[model samples]
Target chain A: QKIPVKVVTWDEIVSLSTKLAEKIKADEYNVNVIVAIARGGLVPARLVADVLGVFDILSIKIEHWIETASHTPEAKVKYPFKVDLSDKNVLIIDDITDTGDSIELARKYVMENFRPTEVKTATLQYIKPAAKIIPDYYAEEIVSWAWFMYPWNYWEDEINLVNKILIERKTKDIDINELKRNFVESYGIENPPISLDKILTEMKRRKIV
Target chain B: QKIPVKVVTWDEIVSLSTKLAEKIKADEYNVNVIVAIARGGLVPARLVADVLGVFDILSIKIEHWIETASHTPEAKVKYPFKVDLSDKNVLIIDDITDTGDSIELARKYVMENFRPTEVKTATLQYIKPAAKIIPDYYAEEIVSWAWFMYPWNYWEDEINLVNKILIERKTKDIDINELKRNFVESYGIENPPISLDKILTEMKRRKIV
Candidate 1:
């Protein structure tokens, strides 16, 4: 069994991503198409795309939540983003592949639409690389808590403010403005806001570590 | 005359990006073209494109930071990338506009390439609104800081990390792996790295956050 992952900090995340990039480049995978499995896959797809010198970053938004009518396997696609996949080698990059339904659907969608010569999948961290299907490139092998970072992951760099806000919220009648002021005084006016929702959504979506 | 615009935190960045999208939809601008300057501009540009409900995101890369090149006015585009810009109402987006040279060059390049109906520019933050040119749309007014989260704004983030690492190094005898582990424990794998040269030259070049 693969080891579980621990990812609450930024350094570990960036380091792991870099290590993955190095590993992929070392393998000499000729990647032409970068199909990010919408939302979750976009971040790592862009990062890996830039590193690998690939340009085409396509997305397949599979609505698997089951609530929306669009959740049907046939209508898994929220947006039909057409790309020139004909005879071109492709790379399918995503955050994590657990059930592998969305990832598999994405591959099928691409092949059905564009008929790519080859379609290879890669994830930043593989929850199960030894399954029926495996990612061509991956970060690490983890089986613990499914890590996640949300859209608010963008604002995570605002360390002082976030930490202060969390503390002030927990402690006695400390004003939010007081925390903001302290954050600004220390970090400056360039920091972003701390949105817990975006963070949770991203982390849950990506299974961050 | 202007509200003291707040600098968004890391978590707020995504929300802000989404907010930018909301504003675009409400305005219902006849969106056709997207001209994103390489690096920083790409983030919001992609976000805005999705929000505006369009797919034609034409991105261009321009380099102009050669010490020996002498920052001349004629040196408008150092490394103008290969792209199409023929007569489209382009919306040029960037993370922020501190120095006018980059914005000016990007606009000029677009105008030169595509004799579009109108070349509009928007930014997330306007650091120097009082300076030569002002952005058409902005979310906040950024104050001068040693660190900011704009694409290509690596110098400050790098310096700050180096200083922090040095301080930690002085305080404790740490190995490289331990230092990396500590950093990862602190920030996720996607958080910015400390080495300024690596951040600016390597990471930015690779298009990694």
Candidate 2:
């Protein structure tokens, strides 16, 4: 059976960020530039950069974890990194490294284009990758076939995740109440405000299930 | 004295969208497709399209409302209009038509690129344009120089708006508390959760104010 998804709270995110910042600083990594994988990494990167007293931040738009009809999660950098990153020690930040697909892609792009002195990756949560890919620094490491819900996109992303599960399960007689209960009890999602009825209706409308 | 900006509420936005949808339906505009000028027009267009029973919704990202260092406010289509619009009647939607620059540019792009049967424009709030450009339908009219605080981007966008005001006012000695009060009172931005001190400190650090 699949394990329940790991739910990360707002306070935990803040604490992780603080710890991550201290860890990086103590390691004496000369990070001259900070690049964030946008949408997810924006806020965490900002916090970490501020703590490190480094503000030369840039972002690359990457699309992943979005719901698709095929139920296959694809990760790729959507836009080109506009600024020059040559000769600088770069620190890349993201919320979590699930399969580490996005991090690997971003690291490859930076290494190829900028030829930075050194590159390091950090995230609040790091699940054991299916492959060899690994982040240089991370706050929490988990070994589970589960999803991590970041505070930044708790409700919206959770809804997408639940919808995705429904599609994958493909049961004619699905109990939405049971699904909601599992979401709260198993995943530890606190008081998820969205109605299960609304979610089910939307999933049907989208033909996701 | 400078004209005070418009403070739009979430409730008001919903009401305006409902009214806009009704108006479009009353007109009997057989909209084959709905085109949203992105960032601003996304939500309104979706609502209107759902009301009109038009499923084929397209977005043309026209970046104009954002604050930039140059402050010239250039309007250009960021992405391509991928769908076929030949012989289709299009309804272009935006949040507000202030200078009407972005809308005009978007309309021009659609007209030049897609040979549509009819192209109409609609916005929630229409400020009497300094230029001759106008929208086909608008819920409300404002004659003053104003900025809109949409429900989707209330907090984050307000920071930029506040920074813009500081730049325009060009004063070193300013009251942060007073500014926060004005934001809550004038803008109806109920319980703006961000600390004013933190915002000011960050703005100063970033050299935005």
Candidate 3:
């Protein structure tokens, strides 16, 4: 059994997303809807929708932190958030499911509430065994926690507003690289004995490079 | 009773918005959030937010068509589809309210779900008898439906993917006049109407001329 690692790099990321996109479109399954798990699922879902030539893309926003500390992230679906999954053949897409907690919770929530005809899960990157459930189809097979490619995450325009404000207020000009380094340093993720090989392997598997 | 046809040119529109914004800030009303009613409310809300330096803007989209039978337009709320208004003071701003049904529905929807701490409504123009509920604050008086100074509506963007596709496919050769004509034609709005005077007067008042 291969041990799971924790990060991936930008290089060696093979994106066979075009293949995945083609498969979805060629299927006779009426995929009139695409539900992206927000903060993670938006990018691929959007790209796939565009490729499939359909515009009705729905996003399901679930806050993992809301239940992380209290119960199994899976059990956190008790709060009953709202989703517009009204009787549609829906495909829920996410970037990666490390713990399977968030994915399962979302899946259960949709099943119990919206009661769609068919709900399929597709992850761009999958960590088998670690995530309780192996997604139907994924771009890459990764057993480590390293280097996940999230197209849209904390880097959205609004999320970076703090840096923008800081730039406006600063009297002295700051080097962009130095500012980013300081941010990472403050977060304490500087250097760990992480598996660089695993990260590279996953990225290569995905053809993201 | 004076049929309040106050000459509020475009300059006055901006000036009036700035003054209202100042008052809002002085009153310490969190003055940060602006919810704009679309199809008509977009411009005034944007100007007000810019003047007051409040950038958190939310657009309320409404689709007004009743299955193509009657010429009369009926409105439906489209996005922010979920309103989370808990303990927040929301300023619902609109350009004008000739028929209050749409605004009223929006207010009801907000009140029923989300339940904001306080919901204040404002409009640039208000028709007294025609509107079932008058906005909290408004400019101008009752006038015929044919006359209203909302120039922005002429150049409104429909928030749909097809509109985006159209924009994407638009090449340099596409005539700008044709685009404007397409827009006006779609909305069933006649050009060179008496409303043009109000719109022109508004531009001059705003000193945009």
Candidate 4:
């Protein structure tokens, strides 16, 4: 059995980001600033900012962690806040909400500190099954959980998944031909992208072998 | 006499922000992301994003605090960074480099943590007199210092300074006409604009009057 993967395209992300932007404008959210979560959210935040012509963008880093024993997901704001966020409409964004802990904890944390304000959490994709809190706005609702590949993280994911496959089979070394056969068995790809061989070269450089 | 303050307008900010944006275009610093210091830097960050047609904007909050014993300025980043900035070219912007502590600390911190990367510091006004670091790009290199105000914080500064005036005068209530005379006497403000009454009314509403 292989992992199901969905490769998303650049155009889709742009359109989805624009979709979220329009909803805010039509709903009239008078957002004073756009505060995006670090990493994945940065792109969507900037995309929405451009679409709505909202120039004021801020960033916060919230790391999603799960308890080892309890197995409950937790999100914490690891970064420090420089200014008071009171008396302003803040639009908090992420690329996707997997556990929903990220945007929720971020929102809850800021509200606890600030006096009074309005916040709307948004994302391009809202994974319905695992998401704890439904985002106020989302471009699409994803039913199943799959590694949604992004243009920016192409090489990152490829190397990671390929390495994972090698680890699972307990093989540190494998020829490209056998790896191609294993790709279908573990990755559900009839023919893996040819460029993935390049990834193998990178894996060698990292001494992943 | 009162504190010397220089009032500024929104148009001036727009002009200065645009000027900084154009220079980035001509110079071509392939900035992958724009990391702005929170609060004031939001506007300039977005303006540059729009003009350069680059939408990736991030923010960090840094407070410049002077050591009480050392009497030297130190800035610390209180915000979290979500993503890996390893290879990305980052453009860091702030409104004004008062003592240059904010931007300098931010730059040093990021550089220390990350691998090889490009960072170009910029701002609308770089106070040449006190700034420890000169911005790589600036709309204007200000030699002298002034309480350069902006429309965004128009009444914020007004309310604050006015409150300071009342606190200095040690009077809770002053008739608008008497306050006008006192404003000139203490603040050097003579027959100020009519909208100032609006701020006093706000101060009263906030129960600070």
- Model 3 Cα lDDT, one tens digit per residue, B1-209: 11212223445555555555555555556653566665455546655664444444554555566666666667776534564657777788777777877678767766676577887777776788688888766655555643443322221112221143235444734443554454355443334322334333333433333
Q: Write the per-residue lDDT of candidate 3 for residues A24-134, one digit (tens) a residue.
A: 645645675666665355445544554444434555555655455675433342213454556678777776767777677767776776677888777777776587877
Model 2 C-alpha lDDT per residue in residues A79-117, reported as the tens digit of each score:
353345677899998888878888898898878866778
Model 3 score (lDDT): 0.53
On TM-score, who's better, 3 or 4?
Answer: 4
- Name every residue pair that clashes in candidate 4: A79-B79, A79-B80, A80-B78, A80-B79
Looking at model 3, residue B160 earns an lDDT score of 24
Superposition error at B147 for model 3 (Å): 26
Worst 10 residues of 3 chain A by lDDT: A150-159
The superposed Cα distance between candidate 3 and the true structure at residue A29, in angstroms, equals: 2.5
* Candidate 4 lDDT tens digits, B140-205: 778777777654455456676677667766445666676677666765667453256866875665
Residue B129 displacement in candidate 1 (angstroms): 8.2
Q: What TM-score against the true fold does each predicted structure earn? A: 0.47, 0.51, 0.43, 0.53
**Candidate 1 vs 4: which has more TM-score:** 4
For model 4, the superposed segments whose C-alpha errors exceed 4 Å read A114-116, A189-194, B1-58, B61-209
Per-residue CA lDDT of candidate 1, range A1-209, in tens? 12222323334544555676667777867777667665556556656665566655555556655645666433276535444567678888777666667677878888887688998888877766334456677787666544343332334433323454455454453344655565455445333334434433333333331
lDDT of 1 by residue, B53-169 (tens): 444555555454646567444324432333344445678877777765667877887787656677878777677644366766666665553235332233334433434554555
List each candidate's DockQ score.
0.05, 0.06, 0.03, 0.06
The lDDT for every candidate, in the order shown, is 0.56, 0.68, 0.53, 0.70
10 residues in a row with least lDDT, candidate 3 chain B: B153-162
Judged by TM-score, which candidate is best? 4
